[PDB]
Ligand binder design. Structure first.
Ligand SMILES: O=c1cc(O)ccn1Cc1ccccc1Oc1ccccc1
Length: 134
């Protein structure tokens, strides 16, 4: 009944490119990068009314965010950044912006074929994370 229905479900990571380099650009330290980089998260997306929930489950860290499109919220990220986040739906792409300490990173999620593709950008570094249905 909504366009964002295409994102709902349970998703598993199938490939990753440039995640270590993205985390370096974020300022994540060595041990966290190693552990986080080994993770194989699942992402569970649900919608209930105007509220979207995105859970991330892994052996490293489990996260859960609930939010309304366009409405800012405070988020503690898996690497323990305290950020101010806003998520919008722009031409079919979920656009998640995180701001902290005068920095910004953007996470875009889109459906491409049977995949859910997450792109994360910090400065000039782009990481691509491809998820498939569980
Ligand atoms: O939510 C996601 C999901 C990813 O696949 C890749 C990155 N992030 C956000 C993220 C940024 C930096 C460090 C970790 C992190 O999220 C996780 C969470 C659990 C496991 C791996 C990455």
């Amino acid at each position: 009944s909504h366009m964002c229905d295409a994102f709902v479900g349970t998703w598993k990571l199938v490939s990753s490119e440039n995640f270590d380099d993205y985390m370096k650009e974020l300022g994540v330290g060595f041990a966290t990068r190693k552990v986080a980089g080994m993770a194989k998260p699942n992402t569970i997306i649900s919608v209930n009314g105007d509220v979207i929930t995105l859970k991330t489950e892994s052996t490293f860290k489990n996260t859960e965010i609930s939010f309304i499109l366009g409405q800012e919220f405070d988020e503690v990220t898996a690497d323990d950044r305290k950020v101010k986040s806003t998520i919008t739906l722009d031409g079919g792409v979920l656009v998640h912006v995180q701001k902290w300490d005068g920095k910004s990173t953007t996470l875009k999620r889109k459906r491409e074929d049977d995949k859910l593709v997450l792109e994360l950008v910090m400065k000039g570094v782009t990481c691509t994370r491809v998820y498939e249905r569980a």
